[PDB]
Design a protein around this ligand. Structure first.
Ligand SMILES: [Zn+2]
Ligand SMILES: [Zn+2]
Length: 1287
């Protein structure tokens, strides 16, 4: 167990537990410091740390020491004995809190027992030397007034009070002659500058600080955790594993980049969580190797140590026994020490991945920041840690007896206000970047607010080096993970070996390197005329001396006038916000504008399913103008085109090394060693793939996800600036009224802020999801594929390398050279799927990833869409698309393939996507419109099959072809085996649902079947179990290829490919999404138009048509004529028959050219009666359920309704539409719907029933029924002449 000593600052010096110490950096000169032994080998010196600092630097100045910290200065801290005593008692309390749990007590025990090796690199291997500044420190025994008498002591840690900056805690190691014992396996006395009262503050982006922007937000740190973070650094230094290696350095070439010190892997390991993932596997191993090497040196020393020249009283055996336990070396029955790989591995992982801030925080139930790379905030002062009502050893601030245990409420700034005090900004110094324009106006931006973008030099290029393979050679993976549970239950973790006595010979060689620090300017001026995120956010603020502002959508005006504030919300929102009303209408106006704010903010949940984008926050570009000028034009469109990439402030240059070649070792005659080499190179190959992915993840996290983090913080600030502006306006307008008026105004400012704040929180959740999705998108589509390219290349090189090796050994391999030759083929055949969980166990990140992978739309690997009279791939995988001159394109995303040789599209797919899942798993979906057969060309139509889409590579692939009325899907595996599935529509139907009409096709392939779906319905199925590997990523050629008629053509739309099998549910949904439109459609499925001649079709009376009756103003209903020739293969009813109708628009007298008919439009239904245009009317005064419609010349009669409202009552896809007669646009009095009715006629000569073009109220209730009745007589379709249909 660990004993924490007790004492008061004024207690007498006893030369044992309370001494007068001579600090290492004092170089054995100057005065001593009263020090207190809080525990064995650990000392507390309650005084400011002054080594390397100038006296005046303890005062706040125009300078700063660290560019990424809001530095608090206070030269009076610890300036009285009572202050010193408070420091002591507080440290005692923190140590008690630390040991209050197993994890912490073990951290302390490891630190107490991790005594520094007696010596360093300059010491002979056969000796212990205690006479060096990193091992021995002196204490003054003599009387006060002379250094006459001193005594030496061994020590592990010396904790001082803070340096100039109170909130800048730091652990320092001792260097001598440019080297550090704590970095070379020996370990050495560690020092620390620490402050328990002024703690750091943080806030989670993906979360919310008690959902209160108007209230204080964020959480303050538990000083016990801050202390344990530093203790972890001490631990590393004591075990001599605080090694340096390739650091993460920030790119600082652009003005928007954040500047900071290089970050060592040891720092990221100490924090834990996701940060270790920013350290690539290559570097993880480099560090591992360096430490192991450090330990080999120590173990050899233990085998060679014979004497201690500096202190004859040192018992060699005791130290050899202690160091053996410290480093976990093993010892044979003779006394020979050696390294036990298993024990070293466990110790290393325990020290680097077990004891971490994140792991300890979780164990002690203390909240901390999400990552090392997260904006730092201004610190706060803790009022009284010594007050058990505010802070306890058992629970810290999160005291259950105060219901502050749940959700870390004790650390919540908005909640536990009695626990802290804000800091005077006058004592704070922050490094700012002054962005000046070439004129002039200047904006100050805190360095913390900028973009942290790791420089390419941050990553190791070790993957480019050659690797020698041997029967020995084994895989090398370092799991940046360690089960904290076992560490806590490790029976032999903590040493049970005697701790040597601390007294020793006084130090006489005070040689040591003392760091020298100095402030740098707190403001750096840079010049740029750019108006990016910083400028846009600034335009949303106003000075403190101003109280009357007005919102504006003009960014430039906002920057120009102090009373003008920029808003990225709607034009309507802005106008309403600046509206001034009378006291009597003020309350109403407040409810209105606040409600509008919520609505505007809520637009963050906008969907864009037609573009295959489930979520889009449309106003982000207007809000920040981040990345590639996202404020100009329409953001949604720009995002559909370029995706996540447009939001990035900078596109990183990735390090993706050409993997080094393998050198296999030969073993002639030795059948085994040769086979082993083959197998080792294979398993090693997988290590390269994994290591490569690791390199990608590290770069994504430190160059890309960091940028997206800044965008999220920016949006949080933007939304708050918007709410603050509105609150300012509301206050101003309210305060213009007199006190008498105010009394009668019903307003609650707390509720206002409550509703605004809630709207913000909802928007933040949406924005967080949107941005995280973008980040993962970039990783998967813009990073991973580039790594796959190199890994695939590597595989090929290694493939020929292995086979060739199997040849040169052909003899020594006898009857197996072939078995292990295919062994290579089948191994290098299957590639390693990328799984982020392998490189990190951060819940937030893993969840982001899993979310992304659960969205079927991310399985889209090809999505050809129209943009600027051209077809391009919007899948994000960058397929190259060449559309040749013979292809016709329109903005309705329709494209036509004709019989011309140049009517072709060439698509070159991305070869770096896991498409070939080995068992064949993918889908193709598209809309198509196939013209009707030519009546005198029916033989060739039914006989000649022609390809329309062909995708082959090495004689393997797939293709879509057509033979008359049949569409065919064909697969051809690597062997040449073939399988087909097809859908054939009938060509003898009176009225067909498919011939020359747009319909939706979807083909899915899995291990077992090949299925064809038509309009969401499964139509065909073919077992493709026997079919082997199918190469599907060759060039896709869209072109009619076969013995076709020169008049043959095909229309297509929305062609897309999924690298997964779509479910019937996914397909149904896609069908409905792509079928959706604000406008009605014609019979062929094209947009319905005004001023276009159409024959009319009735879904409830298919074979009937309308004809103006000869002697009367009515529409008689007749039977359609039919195909008359004698072919046995075809039959149909004529479609171009009956009156030629034409839809005219009612509103806006913009003439009668042409235009799109939209649902709910008011129209006139006319038709041509020879050289005249007649109209369809309804006699106003009928009392029966229905009546015959009145067809006559155009005119305006008081007795007839002439206005029709075109409707769509069906909620499901249909080309049918309905026609409604209402008393007038405004009223809700429905006359009825246009349909067909049967009448009985009995005259002098004829008796029979006849149908007429009518209007009936009966349809009004029927169209409400579910499912929609498609057979209703009020369902009409408009048929215009079309080249795809001849009769
Ligand atoms: Zn640290
Ligand atoms: Zn940062």
């Amino acid at each position: 167990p660990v004993t924490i000593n007790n004492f008061n600052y004024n207690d007498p010096i006893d030369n044992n537990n309370i001494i007068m110490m001579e600090p290492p950096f004092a170089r054995g000169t100057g005065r001593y410091y009263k020090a207190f032994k809080i525990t064995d080998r650990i000392w507390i010196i309650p005084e400011r740390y002054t080594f390397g600092y100038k006296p005046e630097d303890f005062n706040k100045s125009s300078g700063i020491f660290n560019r990424d910290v809001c530095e608090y200065y206070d030269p009076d801290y610890l300036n009285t004995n009572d202050k010193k005593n408070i420091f002591l008692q507080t440290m005692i309390k923190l140590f008690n809190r630390i040991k209050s749990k197993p994890l912490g007590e073990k951290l302390l025990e490891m630190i107490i027992n991790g005594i520094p090796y007696l010596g360093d690199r300059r010491v002979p291997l056969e000796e212990f030397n205690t006479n060096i500044a990193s091992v021995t420190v002196n204490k003054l025994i003599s009387n006060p007034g002379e250094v006459e008498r001193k005594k030496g002591i061994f020590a592990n840690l010396i904790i001082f009070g803070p340096g100039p900056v109170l909130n800048e805690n730091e652990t320092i190691d001792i260097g001598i002659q440019n080297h550090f014992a704590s970095r070379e396996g020996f370990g050495g006395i560690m020092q620390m500058k620490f402050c328990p009262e002024y703690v750091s503050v943080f806030n989670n982006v993906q979360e919310n600080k008690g959902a209160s922007i108007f209230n204080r937000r964020g959480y303050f740190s538990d000083p016990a955790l801050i202390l344990m973070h530093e203790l972890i650094h001490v631990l590393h230094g004591l075990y001599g594993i605080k090694v340096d290696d390739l650091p993460i350095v920030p790119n600082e070439k652009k003005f928007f980049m954040q500047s900071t010190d290089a970050i060592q892997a040891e720092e990221l390991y100490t924090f834990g969580g996701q940060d270790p993932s920013i350290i690539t596997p290559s570097t993880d191993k480099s560090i591992y190797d360096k430490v192991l090497q450090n330990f080999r040196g120590i173990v050899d020393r233990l085998n060679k140590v014979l004497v201690c020249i500096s202190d004859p009283n040192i018992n060699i055996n005791i130290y050899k026994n202690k160091f053996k336990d410290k480093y976990k070396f093993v010892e044979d029955s003779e006394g020979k020490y050696s390294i036990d790989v298993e024990s070293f591995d466990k110790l290393y992982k325990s020290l680097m991945f077990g004891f971490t801030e994140t792991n300890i925080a979780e164990n002690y139930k203390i909240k901390t920041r999400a990552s090392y790379f997260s904006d730092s905030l201004p610190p706060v002062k803790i009022k009284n840690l010594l007050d058990n009502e505010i802070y306890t050893i058992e629970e810290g601030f999160n005291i259950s007896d105060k219901d502050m245990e749940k959700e870390y409420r004790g650390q919540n700034k908005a909640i536990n206000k009695q626990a802290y005090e804000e800091i005077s900004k006058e004592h704070l110094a922050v490094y700012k970047i002054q962005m000046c324009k070439s004129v002039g106006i200047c904006i100050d931006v805190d360095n913390e607010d900028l973009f942290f973008i790791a420089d390419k030099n941050s990553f190791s290029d070790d993957l480019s080096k050659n690797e020698r393979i041997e029967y020995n050679t084994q895989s090398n993976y370092i799991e940046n993970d360690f089960p904290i549970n076992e560490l806590i239950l490790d029976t032999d973790l903590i040493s049970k070996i005697e701790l040597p006595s601390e007294n020793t010979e006084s130090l006489t060689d005070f040689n040591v390197d003392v760091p020298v620090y100095e402030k740098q300017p707190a403001i750096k001026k840079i010049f740029t005329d750019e108006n990016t995120i910083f400028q846009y956010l600034y335009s949303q603020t106003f000075p403190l001396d101003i109280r009357d502002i007005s919102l504006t959508s003009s960014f430039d005006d906002a920057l120009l006038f102090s009373n003008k504030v920029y808003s990225f919300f709607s034009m309507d929102y802005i106008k309403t916000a600046n509206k001034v009303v009378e006291a009597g209408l003020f309350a109403g106006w407040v409810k209105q504008i606040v409600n509008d704010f919520v609505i505007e903010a809520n637009k963050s949940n906008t969907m864009d399913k037609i573009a295959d984008i489930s979520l889009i926050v449309p106003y982000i570009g207007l809000a920040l103008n981040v990345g590639n000028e996202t404020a100009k034009g329409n953001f949604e469109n720009a995002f559909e085109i370029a995706g996540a990439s447009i939001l990035l402030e900078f596109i990183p240059e990735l390090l993706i090394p050409v993997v080094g070649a393998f050198l296999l070792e030969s073993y002639i005659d030795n059948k085994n060693k040769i086979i082993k080499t083959i197998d080792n190179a294979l398993t090693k190959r997988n290590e390269k793939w994994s290591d490569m992915y690791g390199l990608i993840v590290a770069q994504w996290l430190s160059t890309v996800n960091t940028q997206f983090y800044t965008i999220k913080e920016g949006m949080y600030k933007a939304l708050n600036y918007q709410a603050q502006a509105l609150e300012e306006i509301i206050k101003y307008r309210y305060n213009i009224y007199s006190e008498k008026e105010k009394s009668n105004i019903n307003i609650d400012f707390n509720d206002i802020n409550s509703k605004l704040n809630e709207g913000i929180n909802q928007a933040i959740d949406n924005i967080n999801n949107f941005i995280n999705g973008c980040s993962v998108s970039y990783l998967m589509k813009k990073m991973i594929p580039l790594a796959v390219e190199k890994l695939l290349d590597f595989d090929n090189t290694l493939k020929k390398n292995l086979l060739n090796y199997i040849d040169e050994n052909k003899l020594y391999l006898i009857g197996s050279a072939e078995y292990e030759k295919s062994k290579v083929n089948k191994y290098l055949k299957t590639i390693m799927p990328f799984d982020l969980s392998i490189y990190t166990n951060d819940t937030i990140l893993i969840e982001m990833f899993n979310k992304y992978n659960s969205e079927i739309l991310n399985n889209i690997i090809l999505n050809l869409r129209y943009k600027d009279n051209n077809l391009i791939d919007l899948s994000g995988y960058g397929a190259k698309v060449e559309v040749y001159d013979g292809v016709e394109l329109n903005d309705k995303n329709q494209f036509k393939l004709t019989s011309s040789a140049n009517s072709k599209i060439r698509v070159t797919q991305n070869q770096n996507i896991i498409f070939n899942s080995v068992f064949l798993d993918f889908s193709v979906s598209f809309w198509i419109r196939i013209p009707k057969y030519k009546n005198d060309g029916i033989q060739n139509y039914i006989h000649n099959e022609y390809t329309i889409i062909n995708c082959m590579k090495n004689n393997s692939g797939w293709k879509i072809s057509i033979r008359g009325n049949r569409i065919i899907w064909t697969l051809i595996d690597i062997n040449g085996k073939t399988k087909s599935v097809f859908f054939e529509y009938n060509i003898r139907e009176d009225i067909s649902e498919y011939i020359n009409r747009w319909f939706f096709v979807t083909i899915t392939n899995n291990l077992n079947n090949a299925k064809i779906y038509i309009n969401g319905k499964l139509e065909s199925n073919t077992d493709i179990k026997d079919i082997r590997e199918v190469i599907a990523n060759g060039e896709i050629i869209f072109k009619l290829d076969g013995d076709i008629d020169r008049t043959q053509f095909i229309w297509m739309k929305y062609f897309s490919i999924f690298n997964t099998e779509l479910s019937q549910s996914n397909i149904e949904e896609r069908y409905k999404i792509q079928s959706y439109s604000e406008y009605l459609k014609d019979f062929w499925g094209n947009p319905l138009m005004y001023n276009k001649e159409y024959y009319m079709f009735n879904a409830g009376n298919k074979n009937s048509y309308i004809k103006l009756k000869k002697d009367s103003p009515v529409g008689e209903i007749l039977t359609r004529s039919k195909y008359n020739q004698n072919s046995k293969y075809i039959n149909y009813r004529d479609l171009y028959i009956g009156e030629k109708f034409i839809i005219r628009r009612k509103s806006n007298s913009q003439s009668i050219n042409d235009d799109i008919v939209r649902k709910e439009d008011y129209i006139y239904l006319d038709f041509f009666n020879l050289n005249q245009e007649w109209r369809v009317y309804t006699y106003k005064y009928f009392k029966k359920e229905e009546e015959k419609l009145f067809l006559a010349p155009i005119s305006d009669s008081d007795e007839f309704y002439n206005t029709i409202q075109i409707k769509e009552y069906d909620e499901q896809p249909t080309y049918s539409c309905q026609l409604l007669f209402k008393k007038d646009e405004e009223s809700t009095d429905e006359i009825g719907l246009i349909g067909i009715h049967r009448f009985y006629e009995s005259g002098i000569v004829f008796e029979e029933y006849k149908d007429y073009f009518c209007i009936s109220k009966w349809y009004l209730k029927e169209v409400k029924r579910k499912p929609y009745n498609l057979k209703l007589g009020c369902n009409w379709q408009f048929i215009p002449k079309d080249e795809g249909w001849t009769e």
